[PDB]
Design a protein around this ligand. Structure first.
Ligand SMILES: [Zn+2]
Ligand SMILES: [Zn+2]
Ligand SMILES: [Zn+2]
Length: 178
């Protein structure tokens, strides 16, 4: 197995996947690495299994259909994995914890949002459809772009949104377009 966490790239107290060489900190994995379970399979492995059981699930889909899906177990897992893919980028640090807004010439967003809040909401089963999760994720970056205006720091929001959107299109097999 790897000797660093797949998500944060640090060593420490790591749990090892039984079906692949990845390793994780307990609360870096999403969901948090389970208490017992021998063998244990990581989220990457569980997602690959879904795909392998239903090869047709990789054919292209319309976003509008994906967003209306109810959060049954497989869609719950897919959103957990998409959230984890965001955390895998080191620039996610800017969006992880609760933000605050005190900048001359800007006003804070009406509905603040952050990764750890989305994480809690998934854990607590607060989303009934994929749309709920995707809306909160996109809100993180939209709030950032609007608050930071012309400051070059707005680019961090563009960068992390691009990670989110590419992973969304991959995980939910969105139909490729120009
Ligand atoms: Zn970690
Ligand atoms: Zn694995
Ligand atoms: Zn099938």
């Amino acid at each position: 197995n790897s000797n660093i966490c797949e998500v944060c790239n640090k060593w420490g107290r790591l749990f090892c996947c039984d079906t692949c060489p990845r390793s994780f900190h307990e609360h870096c994995h999403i969901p948090s690495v389970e208490a017992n379970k021998n063998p244990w399979s990581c989220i990457f492995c569980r997602i690959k299994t879904i795909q392998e059981r239903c090869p047709e699930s990789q054919s292209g889909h319309q976003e509008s259909e994906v967003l209306m899906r109810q959060m049954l177990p497989e869609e719950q897992l897919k959103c957990e994995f998409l959230l984890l893919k965001v955390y895998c980028d080191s620039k996610s640090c800017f969006f992880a914890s609760e933000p605050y807004y005190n900048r001359e010439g800007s006003q804070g967003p009406q509905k603040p949002m952050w990764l750890n809040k989305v994480k809690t909401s998934l854990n607590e089963q607060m989303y009934t459809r994929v749309e709920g999760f995707v809306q909160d994720m996109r809100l993180i970056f939209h709030n950032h772009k609007e608050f930071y205006r012309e400051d070059k720091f707005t680019r961090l929001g563009i960068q992390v949104q691009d990670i989110f959107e590419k992973n969304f299109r991959n995980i939910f097999a969105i139909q490729e377009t120009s």
